[PDB]
Design a protein around this ligand. Structure first.
Ligand SMILES: [Mg+2]
Ligand SMILES: [Mg+2]
Ligand SMILES: [Mg+2]
Ligand SMILES: [Mg+2]
Ligand SMILES: [Mg+2]
Ligand SMILES: [Mg+2]
Ligand SMILES: [Mg+2]
Ligand SMILES: [Mg+2]
Ligand SMILES: [Mg+2]
Ligand SMILES: [Mg+2]
Ligand SMILES: [Mg+2]
Length: 182
RNA sequence: GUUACGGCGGUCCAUAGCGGCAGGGAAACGCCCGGUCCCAUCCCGAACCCGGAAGCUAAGCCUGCCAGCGCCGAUGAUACUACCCAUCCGGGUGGAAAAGUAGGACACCGCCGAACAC
């Protein structure tokens, strides 16, 4: 009875546009976004685990889902890290949660991006993938700026079903992220 | 009986794998649609589980073709060696490799269950 505007968009207009613009043999060659990944590894828990709790608090308030933290999958003396210390916080999505969060992000954080300049095609990998790292956490609405103690990191990435980068870029710009003009 | 079907199985388990190419949705197979109730995410219906069959075979699977690569492999010879030898010095009979070579080769088969025919 309730469902996200991007879900509808995908069903009716994005799918039709991509089909027309690439002449797929079948309807569903249309790649579809698979997983929005939201993790973080500070690397500072090796000296103090207090900041990890705050980062997870930010992740929970941003998502409402309870992020996990992983240990030192290997151990490195140079990084002063031993296996078993928690360094990486994760929080994942799927489906309606994926696209509600994506709509909120596109509507709020992107126009809210200080000195926003658009994102380039070239950080793809040719297989329809898209991932990079957030300047600052404070960009988000539900988070409180008066309570942020130290500027820490967040990431909410997107992925595709695209076989190559061509379809990935086509559908992604159809969704309408701010690609550069070069 | 046929089948361009699904499970379980075999086999001194790659002649049976990998790679590229083409094709399959009647049923079955996958993907698939949504999470009140079972159940699960060290979060997520991603995994699993559950309700249903709107859609499609792209992925995966299958089958068919390709020698690009894996792969099997002669005869012959060579290496090797059991025994015996001749005043060292290597031969006589027996055994006979590895690699390389012509080539072979894009599995075969069993029991049930599904669509066409009797
Ligand atoms: Mg993709
Ligand atoms: Mg049918
Ligand atoms: Mg789901
Ligand atoms: Mg296909
Ligand atoms: Mg496939
Ligand atoms: Mg071999
Ligand atoms: Mg082979
Ligand atoms: Mg012989
Ligand atoms: Mg003797
Ligand atoms: Mg002699
Ligand atoms: Mg031989």
């Amino acid at each position: 009875k309730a469902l996200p505007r991007l879900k509808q968009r995908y069903r009716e207009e994005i799918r039709e546009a991509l089909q027309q613009e690439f002449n797929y043999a079948n309807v569903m060659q249309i790649p579809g976004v698979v997983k929005v990944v939201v993790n973080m590894g500070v690397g500072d828990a090796a000296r103090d685990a207090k900041l990890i709790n705050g980062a997870i608090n930010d992740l929970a308030l941003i998502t409402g889902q309870k992020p996990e933290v992983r240990r030192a999958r290997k151990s490195i003396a140079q990084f002063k890290l031993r296996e078993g210390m928690p360094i990486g916080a994760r929080v994942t999505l799927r489906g309606d949660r994926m696209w509600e969060f994506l709509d909120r992000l596109i509507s709020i954080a992107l126009p809210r991006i200080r000195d926003f300049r658009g994102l380039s095609p070239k950080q793809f990998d040719g297989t329809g993938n898209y991932t990079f790292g957030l300047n600052e956490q404070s960009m988000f609405h539900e988070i409180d700026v008066d309570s942020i103690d130290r500027p820490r990191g967040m990431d909410i990435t997107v992925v595709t079903t695209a076989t190559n980068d061509a379809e990935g870029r086509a559908l992604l710009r159809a969704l309408g992220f701010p690609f550069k003009e070069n």
